[PDB]
Amino acid sequence: QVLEGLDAVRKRPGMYIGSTDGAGLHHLVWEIVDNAVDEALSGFGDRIDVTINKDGSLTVQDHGRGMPTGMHAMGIPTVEVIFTILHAVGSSVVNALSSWLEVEITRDGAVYKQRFENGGKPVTTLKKIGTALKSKTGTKVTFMPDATIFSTTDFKYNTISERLNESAFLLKNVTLSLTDKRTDEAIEFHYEN
Ligand SMILES: C=CCNC(=O)Nc1nc2cc(-c3cccnc3)c(=O)n(CCC(C)C)c2s1
Fold it and tell me: Which of 24, 23, 5 is CA-nearest to residue 116?
């Protein structure tokens, strides 16, 4: 397996997300959402909240275990490795195609954050920013799609709502929410089995 950096994604985005139109833009949402859904399917977390922010960015929040907060080689956080090496995989592809991205992790009584800019270059390490109850766990990913790559950077509420509805139906017993801060629209989906 040949590992690559984020420049490879930026030079051939269609190879990773199919296209650079609205379909590709929304693939970025699906990758992040799917990672939160995988975590819930494994039994960690019973709600997944998606927000379309007024500035054009998009946030996904889960209440799963929290991405690992430790280090890989050479003092590099595991989360930085997840977000910056392409195993050619969604997290690194979204980072590559974002003008900025923030990941916030909560676990073990601590809240940590790392910020990337300009196609996924870290501008901070994984920094402890605060504290939380020892019981509190999860991951939050916010990203701004790169307007230099996509033909449209307008997330579509109806498109996202349909996909989260479907994902709630497949998962069971997990609430998926969508809030649009541009229009104030909001919806929740939950299917009990
Ligand atoms: C909110 C937006 C998106 N949501 C997520 O990405 N949520 C996640 N939760 C976890 C929990 C654990 C994990 C496993 C084993 C033990 N403790 C934590 C973990 O390894 N991951 C990395 C999996 C791959 C992305 C490397 C994640 S990714």
Answer: 5
CATH number at residue 68: 3.30.565.10
Q: Is 91 in the pocket of ligand 1 (CB under 6 A)?
A: yes
Report whether 113 contacts 161 (CB < 8 A).
Answer: no
Resolution (A): 1.8
Answer yes or no: is 123 a known binding residue: no
Rg of the chain (C-alpha set): 16
Report the half-sphere exposure of 55 (CA within 13 A, side-chain side). 10
Q: Does the CB atom of residue 45 touch ligand 1 within 6 A?
A: no
Experimental approach taken: X-ray
| Beta carbons within 10 angstroms of residue 34's beta carbon | 15
Q: Is the CB of 36 under 6 A from ligand 1?
A: yes
3-state SS assignment for residue 47: strand
Nearest-10 crossing angle of helices 22-41, 157-171: 20
Q: Which domain holds residue 116?
A: 1-193
Of 122, 133, 76, give the one whose Cα is nearest residue 100: 122
Read out DSSP for 172-190?
-S-EEEEEETTT--EEEE-
Domains: count for the chain: 1
For a substitution probing ligand 1, which of 67, 103, 112, 143 has the most ligand atoms within 8 Å of its CB?
67
90 in a known ligand binding site: yes
